[PDB]
């Protein structure tokens, strides 16, 4: 049994599930590499959990993301949320708490919606 972690990301009807296990660096979304995530114009939204912390944080793990629902924009936001939360959870479960806190600080400083779900519920006046 390898060390593995399951996390979820949401944006509207989209839902992404990330499995982060011990590995070599394979980052796949829907059975396809992360560098083919469409659209081109929004690929860096998917990339930015990787680029905020560094690829060295991803050097020893495998991320596998399965996404259903929603549209292109919703699915991109669900992917990036699931990947960020899976990084934080893996570094808290099998790596140090200091690494977890530093990752959470970086992600929170850039964008909290990487970590906490953005729910646009109605507000009656």
């Amino acid at each position: 049994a390898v060390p593995s972690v399951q996390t979820f990301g949401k944006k509207k009807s989209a839902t992404a599930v990330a499995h982060v296990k011990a590995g070599k660096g394979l980052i796949k979304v829907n059975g396809s590499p992360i560098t083919l995530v469409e659209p081109e114009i929004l690929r860096f939204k998917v990339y930015e959990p990787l680029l905020l912390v560094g690829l060295d944080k991803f050097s020893n793990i495998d991320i596998r993301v399965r996404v259903t629902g929603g549209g292109h924009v919703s699915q991109v936001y669900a992917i990036r949320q699931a990947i960020a939360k899976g990084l934080v959870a893996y570094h808290q479960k099998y790596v140090d708490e200091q690494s977890k806190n530093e990752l959470k600080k970086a992600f929170t400083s850039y964008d909290r919606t990487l970590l906490i779900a953005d729910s646009r519920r109605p507000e009656p006046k």
Partner: protein, 282 residues
Amino acid sequence: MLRRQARERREYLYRKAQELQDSQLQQKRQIIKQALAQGKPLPKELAEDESLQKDFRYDQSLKQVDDEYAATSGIMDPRIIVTTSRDPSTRLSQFAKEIKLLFPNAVRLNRGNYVMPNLVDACKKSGTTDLVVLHEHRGVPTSLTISHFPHGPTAQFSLHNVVMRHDIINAGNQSEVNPHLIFDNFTTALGKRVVCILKHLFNAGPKKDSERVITFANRGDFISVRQHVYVRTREGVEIAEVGPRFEMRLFELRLGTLENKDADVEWQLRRFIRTANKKDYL
């Protein structure tokens, strides 16, 4: 709050279940009260029911708004949200503004892309008492739904003969005062239920000099709604029509909110019964 509302709904439905046996024991106790008052003999079953006679020494001290409206009748004023169907036309938006101005504590809310379960949850957490949804057929309002929160009745009305202030009135603004209500010709229990539902949309205790009068009059299961302004001349009261005029027809009454389709039906219109023409239910 998700666990609180489900539990309170269960308790409410349990009370509705036990209400029948409670009523039956109430008539069994009412025979004893009349028998003790008049010196009348008891029937055989009440004579030989020893447990009821032993419990009457306790239950002798037991003695009206409906159950959904009992807790806050006259204590806290209502909050009403008036909304429309999914893609309202300009004329439906005008009528929604008119209905919002008709009610004294009501805000008109854009439907947009709002889902009904999300809207009901938003209304519950925001603390609104009532939700009114308006439907139309090419600019003509055809349906008006009133739902009481958190688990109150949902009544659906078919609107006929709709005339709007944007049409009749060339100018003038509505008074927006706490009005005086007139409920006419509501005799049956269904009529009392409709009177309770419609009455509790308005603020409690209008002051005596209020010039706005809102009238709901029952003619042949059709409720005429009028809004008038009166001036007390020494000769008499002269009346000015100041608001929209429409006829509304109750066709469905359910014991749940708008989101719930499994809610029990208190009353439904039956069009195809053989003797449907003869009866007047309201």
